[PDB]
Ligand SMILES: *[C@H](O)[C@H](C[C@@H]1CCNC1=O)NC(=O)[C@H](CC(C)C)NC(=O)OC[C@@H]1CCC(=O)N1C[C@H]1C[C@@H]2C=C[C@H]1C2
């Protein structure tokens with residue numbers, strides 16, 4: 275065993291922020307921070323109108339009294355809405371009570387290849403947690419059912435929660451996408467119930483490098499050769515072979531120092547392994563793995579945060 | 580026949596009233612003053628001899644409120660007292676004792692590749708020029724910035740609301756530029772330190788090339804239009820093999836297709852042929868594909884939408 279698992283942040287601080295938002299006949303989840311509740315704006319749309327909503331007119335049609343916000347877990351509460359606004363694909367509802375359990379937090383956009391934790395919620399109740407990597411095509415391979423919209427994704431730096439994702443939709447191929455908290459959708463997606471052009475996914479090269487380092491840290495290094503491929507040369511190759519371009523980080527550099535294996539050795543290895551594992555395995559796998567980040571490998575195997 | 584297309588920025592007056600000079604030690608740059616907050620690049624704290632690998636966490640802890648001098652030069656001049664300081668990603672959040680009386684209605688958003696925004700280029704807190712750029716697919720912009728321009732801001736405008744999307748940070752080796760969003764993340768994989776950085780490959784923005792071909796058709800230049808069509812799905816496979824972004828249609832593109840009667844798929848086919856060479860002909864005075872004008876630019880400037 276590699277010692278790697280899909281590891282999420284503990285979810286308790288975020289659980290204490292989750293609420294149910296109802297607007298007429300629709301209901302979904304919201305995030306209660308300070309005096310604000312964030313939720314997907316399509317809670318305003320009638321179920322027979324999700325294909326072509328005019329969110330501007332829907333917002334005008336609403337009053338503060340049109341929204342009901344309920345906290346179900348912990349100490350239950352019904353929150354009076356005293357203001358409402360739209361930002362991109364999210365609603366910003368102002369409530370009369372500040373969440374007493376508001377954690378230290380920021381809003382940040384997550385980048386392709388980076389990992390974050392998701393708290394899956396239904397009717398304002400947390401039901402599970404998992405971690406995903408933002409794919410190069412700005413989808414995530416998640417697990418979301420009807421009623422999950424408004425479920426949140428986040429990272430944590432120290433005690434500060436960095437909210438990066440609010441769930442909106444499932445694509446035809448079964449992957450998922452949603453909004454950052456500036457209200458933009460990830461990728462080119464729109465929050466309407468129409469089939470949409472979803473872009474080509476790629477192998478995340480930096481994460482494949484991290485995984486090969488995890489294998490070396492486990493004493494599995496049959497694929498390591500003296501041969502090296504430069505970052506520039508690898509990146510020209512990656513463009514032709516459905517890999518993201520490799521951008522080194524201090525986290526990757528720490529793996530290189532610990533193992534004594536240079537990044538360029540693993541970039542050469544990836545080019546060979548992409549043509550076939552030749553009947554061999556790496557960490558029990560016969561294919562490249564890009565769902566573990568350099569930070570994952572440093573933390574889980576080396577204890578370096 | 581001049582197309583009627585120019586690089587058209589928003590009037591800058593609303594944003595000029597928000598620019599300030601921020602000085603820390605012997606480093607100076609520009610800041611954005613909204614309500615009681617001044618945003619600026621965090622490398623204002625870094626000594627000029629330390630920019631290659633700054634310890635920004637240690638630098639921030641060493642500062643006091645008195646380390647920062649904030650001055651408004653244009654309009655009604657003022658020297659603003661800093662009463663709090665914090666770091667959000669690659670930006671500093673300085674709290675000042677007086678709210679900007681000229682704060683416009685505003686939001687913070689992230690701009691996506693191919694989208695246009697306006698830039699107010701500033702030096703020592705003084706606006707000096709305005710221009711418009713499109714975010715490149717490698718998350719750089721083709722700007723015009725010199726020493727002292729950091730903290731210059733980019734924005735779009737929806738109605739009277741200014742959507743701030745960019746704070747200038749650096750110039751890359753190839754002469755292009757990049758910066759931060761106001762969540763503090765750098766665009767792309769870039770880091771705000773003075774070191775060599777991998778530059779991802781740029782691509783043609785297919786949606787903008789399509790917009791430009793519609794501009795040509797609207798101007799009576801339609802020799803490249805044929806009955807032949809390429810589907811979006813087929814074009815996007817071709818695009819990944821030819822350094823184009825994948826095409827995602829929008830309502831703005833659809834408006835161009837309806838006005839001209841030329842289907843998107845006809846222009847996707849045309850792009851594929853034109854990319855191999857214009858065969859000695861010109862389109863709107865050019866012998867190569869143009870991707871610096873958006874569907875919205877064409878709708879606004881040519882059809883007057
Ligand atoms: C919000 O809770 C919900 C989350 C979804 C539900 C299933 N899994 C999820 O992650 N979001 C939606 O239902 C959104 C709402 C939009 C953004 C206004 N719609 C959505 O995800 O739609 C998916 C696709 C898009 C086209 C479409 O009709 N459709 C639904 C599928 C499901 C049924 C089988 C085929 C169609 C109908």
Ligand SMILES: *[C@H](O)[C@H](C[C@@H]1CCNC1=O)NC(=O)[C@H](CC(C)C)NC(=O)OC[C@@H]1CCC(=O)N1C[C@H]1C[C@@H]2C=C[C@H]1C2
Pocket residue numbers: 608622630724725726727728729730748749750751752753756770771772773774775776
């Ligand atoms: C802030 O005012 C300033 C704006 C720059 C100045 C020139 N044009 C701009 O856009 N920003 C900087 O000086 C930053 C500071 C960093 C982020 C701490 N550095 C910067 O822009 O460096 C640019 C230099 C000069 C041109 C160039 O290629 N380059 C990058 C360095 C790094 C590699 C080693 C030498 C070259 C390549």
